[PDB]
Amino acid sequence: MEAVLNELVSVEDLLKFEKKFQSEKAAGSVSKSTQFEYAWCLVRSKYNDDIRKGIVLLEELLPKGSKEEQRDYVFYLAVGNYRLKEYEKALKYVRGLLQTEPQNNQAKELERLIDKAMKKDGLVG
């Protein structure tokens, strides 16, 4: 149902969401949607420092979310950590999601990708 793109977010879109984030942060109150949307762009970036910034923003969002939103935040924290080969963190997040949502086919596939990436690197966990 999809094609494999290499550039998942343009520099212009990353900057648009960065600008709104920094506007709100300087004005004192940041919308959850503004912070999440920026983080969501960051975690799709090609660059490691972007993905790390997105993980930071998602961890800050976690205590502000409804239980449904927290599940989405934890999923994207698993994705970002996976891409950075922060395997222990990626497993912690996705396995926590899989006990609170054992039917989640997306979480199960992400766990399989993490497992394969760890075995490729010769690691256990």
Binding site: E2, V4, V43, K46, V79, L84, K85, Q106, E109
Partner: peptide, 11 residues
């Protein structure tokens, strides 16, 4: 260390 792993394709 260098490039991030690809964003998971099923997304």
């Amino acid at each position: 260390k260098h490039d991030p792993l690809p964003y998971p394709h099923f997304l």
